[PDB]
Amino acid sequence: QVLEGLDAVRKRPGMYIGSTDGAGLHHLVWEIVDNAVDEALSGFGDRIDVTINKDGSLTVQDHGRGMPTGMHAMGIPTVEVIFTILHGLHGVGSSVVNALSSWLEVEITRDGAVYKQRFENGGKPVTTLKKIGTALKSKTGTKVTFMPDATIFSTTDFKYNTISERLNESAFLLKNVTLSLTDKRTDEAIEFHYEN
Ligand SMILES: CCNC(=O)c1cc2c(-n3ccc(C(F)(F)F)n3)c(-c3cncc(C(=O)O)c3)cnc2[nH]1
């Protein structure tokens, strides 16, 4: 298996996300949401919150275990490896989203600590995974916020109705997990939850 850096994604986006139109833009949302959904399917976290921010960025927050906060090789955080190397690694498409974003932030909460790493300009880390604060030991989760790269996509406008429909469908497949969407541009909001 040949590993590659994020440049490879930026030079052939359609190979990873299908296109660079609205469909491809929204593929970025699906990749991050799917990470949260996979974690919930494994039994960790009962709500997944999606927010379309006023600045055009998008946030997905889960309440799962939190990504591992330890080191890979050479003092490089596991989180950094997941977000900057691909074949995406270990079952997530986070690296593809990072590659196609002008910036991305990942915040992890677990073990009484809050950690954050920031990437810019197609996934170049501008910080390490830094402890930024504390939380109760019972608090766990992962939050990812990204700004899609306007130099790549023909549209960077997230569509509320498109996201709403997909999250509704995901809530129906998952069961017993609340999927929420909030649009800070318009104040629109909706939640989905299907019991079984
Ligand atoms: C908001 C979007 N959520 C994520 O992208 C997300 C990834 C993720 C995750 N990860 C997905 C891949 C990875 C890993 F490769 F970094 F381990 N973590 C794990 C996780 C997975 N496997 C083990 C543990 C653990 O605590 O032992 C944790 C837990 N929550 C997650 N949310």
Structural domains of the chain in order of their starting residue, each with its CATH number: 1-196 (3.30.565.10)
> Tokens representing 162?
């498109």
Stated in angstroms to one decimal place, the resolution of this structure is: 1.7
CA-nearest residue for atom 15, ligand 1, is 90
β strands within the chain, DSSP E:
47-52, 58-62, 101-110, 113-120, 124-125, 130-134, 141-148, 178-183, 189-192
User: Which ranges of 49-112 would DSSP assign to H, the alpha helix?
Assistant: 78-84, 94-99
The type of residue at 14 is: G
Scanning the structure block, which residue is given the tokens 């074949």? Answer: 87
Q: CA 147 to CA 120: how far, in whole Å?
A: 9
The protein residue whose alpha carbon is closest to atom 2 in ligand 1 is 36
Would the CB of 112 count as within 6 Å of ligand 1? no
Q: Which of 16, 20, 52, 24 is nearest to 145 (CA)?
A: 52
Q: Is the CB of 58 under 6 A from ligand 1?
A: no
**DSSP annotation of 154:** S
| Rounded distance between C-alpha atoms, residue 94 and residue 86, angstroms | 9
